[PDB]
Amino acid sequence: GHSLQDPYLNTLRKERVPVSIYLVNGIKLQGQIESFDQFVILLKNTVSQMVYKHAISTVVPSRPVRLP
Amino acid sequence: KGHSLQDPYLNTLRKERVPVSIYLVNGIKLQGQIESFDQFVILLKNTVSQMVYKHAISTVVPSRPVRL
Amino acid sequence: SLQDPYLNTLRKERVPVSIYLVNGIKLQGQIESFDQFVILLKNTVSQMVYKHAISTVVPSRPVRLP
Amino acid sequence: HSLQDPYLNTLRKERVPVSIYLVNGIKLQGQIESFDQFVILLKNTVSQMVYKHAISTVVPSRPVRLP
Amino acid sequence: SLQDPYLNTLRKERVPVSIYLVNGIKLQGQIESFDQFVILLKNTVSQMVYKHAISTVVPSRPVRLP
Amino acid sequence: HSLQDPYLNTLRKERVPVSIYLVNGIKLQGQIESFDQFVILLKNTVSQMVYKHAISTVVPSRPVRL
Ligand SMILES: O=c1ccn([C@@H]2O[C@H](COP(=O)(O)OP(=O)(O)OP(=O)(O)O)[C@@H](O)[C@H]2O)c(=O)[nH]1
Ligand SMILES: O=c1ccn([C@@H]2O[C@H](COP(=O)(O)OP(=O)(O)OP(=O)(O)O)[C@@H](O)[C@H]2O)c(=O)[nH]1
Ligand SMILES: O=c1ccn([C@@H]2O[C@H](COP(=O)(O)OP(=O)(O)OP(=O)(O)O)[C@@H](O)[C@H]2O)c(=O)[nH]1
Ligand SMILES: O=c1ccn([C@@H]2O[C@H](COP(=O)(O)OP(=O)(O)OP(=O)(O)O)[C@@H](O)[C@H]2O)c(=O)[nH]1
Ligand SMILES: O=c1ccn([C@@H]2O[C@H](COP(=O)(O)OP(=O)(O)OP(=O)(O)O)[C@@H](O)[C@H]2O)c(=O)[nH]1
Ligand SMILES: O=c1ccn([C@@H]2O[C@H](COP(=O)(O)OP(=O)(O)OP(=O)(O)O)[C@@H](O)[C@H]2O)c(=O)[nH]1
């Protein structure tokens, strides 16, 4: 179901891992994951922007991450 | 489309009438205040309003920080 | 909920609109009719427009909104 | 679907030449042979199955009268 | 309802097909199998193609629908 | 859905080198670490999470069981 996505985003959230989010148009967003629901992710930097998952290509952490 | 934190976040932006930038999947940038929204669309006000499809939005960026 | 009556007002009141497509294309006309997935837009040429291909709908004048 | 289906159906029955514009800007042409909930079968000069999700607009060569 | 038999007929008759992606890339091969969301397109190796990425499917020779 | 899963699982368990082509034309290379209904974790020098909706095609570097 969400058995990979949730713990992945959640781990990045709890550990405040700096991430780069890449959009399908090729824009690179940067910050940390503040929050997420089944459709969006709140990306924190200057302010917290809301990113639609449907617009995301990849999420790439700035360092390796242990899934729980 | 409509879920656990997208709604409260968008509702907050509506209620506090915070100017936002809305970036579309094709890179175009819209600006305005969120008048209202449902599961699929968002009404964005300036001269006349405009109905923006959620499916075409990549990110919503508030002009100043905001509390969730 | 919000989409349907908003389109309906534009339809019922014959309001000229610009429909911008996700690829940048700007279509113009008046909304003849619509359903859950498409919008039929007339004048110049008539055409059936998929909603999934639309980014925004911009009326040529302010609209009653509720 | 109360608009889409009879619209395509009429185009289908009356063999109306149509131009189908893809979301990527490409124009397909021909007549509709059949369709279902997700695809459209387009015939003649080039015969081919089109996914609805890649379609932006269907522009018939002449307006259609709905039943 | 029409997608299935069209793809099955192309499959069973080993018709070589051209699959155009929404980004404009053209893939070529034979349909090995398929399900609700993807198509397995056979050639050098078999690649998995997401339907959501496909714009058109064009057979190299005419298909007789059953 | 009955076909995407076993295919990905095979690539995963045999740790087969793969290229993943995104809907925007970008090519990613690596190996499938894991996956669920919506995302694929792609391993390499830097691991990353890839939404299926952004993928056009998965292409293994060698032929695989089907
Ligand atoms: O922003 C969020 C945060 C959390 N969740 C979801 O909430 C559920 C619980 O998320 P938690 O992170 O609260 O679980 P936890 O008990 O491990 O956290 P701590 O109390 O130890 O800090 C998880 O299933 C996660 O997917 C979200 O969906 N979005
Ligand atoms: O345009 C809108 C407005 C509101 N809503 C949704 O309607 C629900 C009620 O939204 P409200 O914001 O009106 O309820 P509230 O009680 O929080 O407001 P106040 O009395 O404090 O003024 C909320 O869940 C909101 O997300 C929309 O979905 N779209
Ligand atoms: O092309 C259309 C027209 C109308 N409708 C939908 O069909 C329903 C009936 O559409 P009507 O246009 O008959 O409703 P009405 O005039 O009675 O509405 P009010 O003046 O009372 O506001 C409305 O809910 C509309 O959203 C469509 O779905 N497509
Ligand atoms: O390729 C097709 C053809 C037809 N149909 C759908 O099959 C149904 C039967 O379509 P028909 O064309 O066989 O019946 P009809 O139009 O004479 O009947 P009415 O629509 O006047 O009631 C119609 O609802 C049509 O939309 C498809 O879904 N795909
Ligand atoms: O790779 C495949 C092959 C087949 N199928 C689907 O499984 C069902 C059985 O497909 P078959 O092709 O095994 O049935 P059959 O030999 O009796 O040929 P038809 O009567 O279907 O013409 C058909 O509905 C087909 O669409 C797939 O979904 N994927
Ligand atoms: O990253 C993964 C790995 C595995 N899976 C899926 O979860 C299940 C894990 O199953 P496994 O691949 O670990 O074992 P198996 O099914 O071959 O062995 P049995 O348990 O059937 O005896 C399989 O159904 C696989 O498709 C994922 O969804 N994501």
Its sign, for the CA torsion E33, E38, E42, E45, is negative
Contact D50 E56 (CB under 8 A): yes
Residues of D in contact with E57 (CB under 8 A): 48-49
Q: To which H or E segment does residue E56 belong? A: strand E54-59
Nearest to E45 among F2, F24, F60 (CB): F60
Helix (H) or strand (E) holding A61: strand A56-61
Query: Does ligand 1 have an atom closer than 6 angstroms to the CB of A49?
Result: no
Q: Which atom of ligand 3 is nearest to the CA of C9?
A: 22
Count of Cβ atoms closer than 10 Å to residue F12 Cβ: 18
In angstroms, the CA A12 to CA A14 distance is 6
What are the residues facing A48 on neighbouring strands? A44
Ranges of H-type helices in chain F = 4-13
Amino acid at D4: Q
- C-alpha to C-alpha distance for A59 and B34, rounded to whole angstroms: 28
CA distance B7 to B15: 12
Among candidates C39, F48, D7, which has minimal Cα distance to A59? F48
- Whether residues A58 and F50 touch (CB distance < 8 A) is answered with yes
Ligand having the closest approach to the CA of D14: 4
Q: Give the domain ranges of chain C.
A: 1-66
Among all ligands shown, which has an atom nearest to the Cα of B45? Answer: 2
Given a contact cutoff of 8 angstroms between Cβ atoms, the answer to whether E33 and E41 are in contact is no
Nearest ligand 4 atom, CA D9: 26
The set of residues, in sequence order, having a beta carbon less than 8 Å from that of B40 and lying 6+ positions away, is B1, B53, B54, B55, C3
Q: How was this structure determined?
A: X-ray
Q: How many residues does chain F have?
A: 66
| Triad F64, A3, A40: Cα angle to 5° | 110
Other Cβ atoms within 10 Å of F47 Cβ, number: 15
The answer to whether residue C40 neighbours chain D at the CB level (below 8 Å) is yes
Distance CA E25, CA A20 (A): 27
Q: Are D39 and D54 in contact (CB under 8 A)?
A: no
D14 CA to centre of ligand 6 in angstroms: 51
CA distance E50 to A44: 32
Q: Is C66 exposed, middle or buried (0-12, 13-18, 19+ CB in 10 A)?
A: exposed
CA D38 to chain centre: 12
CA distances from B22 to B31, B55, D66, F13 (A): 6, 12, 38, 42
Integer Cα distance of E25 and E55 in angstroms: 10
- E24-50 burial, b if ≥16 CB within 10 A, otherwise e? eeebebbbbbbeeebbbbbeeebbbbb
In chain C, residues with a C-beta closer than 8 Å to the C-beta of D32 are: none
CA pair distance F18, E39, nearest whole angstrom: 17
> Is the CB of residue E37 less than 8 Å from the CB of residue E46?
no
4-23 in F: which are within 8 Å (CB) of A?
Answer: 22-23
| E44-49 LR contacts (CB < 8 Å, sep 24+) | E45/F59, E45/F60, E45/F61, E45/F62, E45/F63, E45/F64, E46/F60, E46/F63, E46/F64, E46/F66, E47/F57, E47/F58, E47/F59, E47/F60, E48/F4, E48/F7, E48/F57, E48/F58, E48/F59, E49/E19, E49/E21, E49/F56, E49/F57
Domain formed by A1-68, architecture: Roll (2.30)
Query: Which residues lie across from F29 on neighbouring strands?
Result: F19
Contacts 24+ apart (CB under 8 A), C28-33: C31/C7, C33/D3
Asked if the F1-66 domain carries CATH number 2.30.30.100, the reply is yes
- The CATH code of domain D1-67 reads 2.30.30.100
Tokens of D63: 């307006």
> Is residue F33 helix, strand or coil?
strand
Chain F touched by E55 (CB under 8 Å) = no
Expressed in Å, this structure's resolution amounts to 2.2
Rounded to the nearest 5°, which phi and psi values hold at E61? Answer: -140, 155
The CA distances from residue B35 to B42, B44, B52, C2, C66, in Å, are: 8, 6, 11, 11, 11
To the nearest whole Å, the CA of B28 is away from the closest chain C CA by 8
Residue entry with tokens 């709890």: A14
Taking CA–CA distances from D52, the nearest residue in chain E reads E55
Q: For residue C46, how many C-alpha atoms fall within 13 Å in the half-sphere facing its CB?
A: 14
Tell me how far apart the alpha carbons of residues F34 and F48 are, in angstroms, rounded to a whole number: 11
Tell me the DSSP string of B5-65: THHHHHHHHHHTT--EEEEETTS-EEEEEEEEE-SSEEEEESSS--EEEGGGEEEEEESS-
Binding pocket residue ranges, ligand 4, CB within 6 Å: D 5, 9, 12, 34-36, 67
Residue of C nearest to B25 (CA): C22
F36 Cα to the center of ligand 6, angstroms:
10
